[PDB]
């Protein structure tokens, strides 16, 4: 189904341009897809909503009385 | 697989090729019928090292009982051919 | 041509046989084929009745 490739016996085997260009193209598409998704959808790795700090919240919103009312 | 059907000439050529890369043997003096400790003055350890080098060369390993009595390149070739069922 | 005949003798005929068997014999008996009822969302219209489904209560939309 392919072309005729001869054995080498201690030399580099024959390589057709088709397989090399196909592998390079597929790797290029993989990396291009990774970069495109990182650019367009970057919150999938870093997040979109910031993590709130529990210590920054004031007692007014947390229903805390100054330890005298009750 | 697409493996070619290796022949007696190919086996002998590969055996001689492996033997000539062994610098302890003079390339211009070695022959197909050269003995190891007699024609070449080798030792038993060198003999087993040659056996293992051929083992790696041909991708199959010879049992020790058969390896310790393969003393000439011609009979090594014939042993490999008998193992692989080579016609000509 | 090979694919043309293959799609007829291996795809079309099984589709015909199964469609007949399901439509005229399997569904002839009750509860043989049961479909999960379609999802209903506000603002939709039912084909059988034609009445419009009431929308939401205009929740406060901000960001």
């Amino acid at each position: 189904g392919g072309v005729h490739i001869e054995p080498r016996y201690r030399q580099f085997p024959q390589l057709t341009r088709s397989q090399l260009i196909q592998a390079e193209f597929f790797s290029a598409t993989m990396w291009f897809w990774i970069l495109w998704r990182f650019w367009h959808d970057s919150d999938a790795v870093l997040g979109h909503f910031p993590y709130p700090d529990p210590s920054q919240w004031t007692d007014e919103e947390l229903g805390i009385l100054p330890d005298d009312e009750d | 697989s697409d493996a070619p059907p290796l022949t007696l000439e190919a086996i002998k050529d590969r055996v001689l090729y492996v033997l000539k890369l062994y610098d302890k043997i003079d390339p211009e003096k070695l022959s197909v019928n050269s003995h190891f400790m007699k024609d070449l003055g080798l030792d038993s350890l060198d003999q087993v090292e040659i056996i293992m080098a051929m083992e790696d060369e041909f991708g199959f390993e010879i049992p020790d009982i058969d390896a310790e009595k393969l003393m000439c390149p011609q009979e090594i070739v014939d042993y490999i051919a008998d193992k692989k069922d080579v016609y000509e | 041509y090979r694919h043309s005949i293959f799609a007829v003798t291996h795809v079309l005929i099984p589709v015909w046989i199964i469609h007949y068997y399901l439509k005229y014999h399997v569904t002839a008996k009750p509860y043989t084929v049961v479909e999960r009822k379609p999802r209903i969302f506000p603002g939709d219209t039912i084909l059988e009745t034609g009445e419009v489904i009431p929308l939401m209560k205009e929740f406060p939309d901000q960001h």
């Binding site: 001869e6 897809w33 | 000539k20 062994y22 | -």
Partner: protein, 84 residues
């Protein structure tokens, strides 16, 4: 149809220790007073197309250049098409 073309074995004198890490093995063995007799038999593994190697990170970034160029041209086309 089979692969019968009468392939001939290469010349055996081209295989040399030079330009190979077998040089270091030979030097380290001679520093103690020993020699490796099977050095040349494995020279073909460092001679031809196998002479050059690639790092793990270099292997991972196989098509980084073409992919980066494609990403740059695509984002440029998007920028120049949206602004209208």
């Amino acid at each position: 149809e089979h692969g019968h073309s009468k392939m001939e074995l290469p010349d055996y004198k081209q295989w040399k220790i030079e330009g190979t890490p077998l040089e270091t093995v030979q030097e380290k063995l001679a520093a103690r007073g020993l020699r490796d007799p099977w050095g040349r038999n494995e020279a073909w593994r460092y001679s031809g197309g196998f002479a050059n190697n690639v790092s793990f990170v270099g292997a991972l970034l196989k098509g980084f250049k073409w992919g980066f160029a494609a990403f740059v041209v695509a984002v440029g086309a998007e920028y120049y098409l949206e602004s209208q």
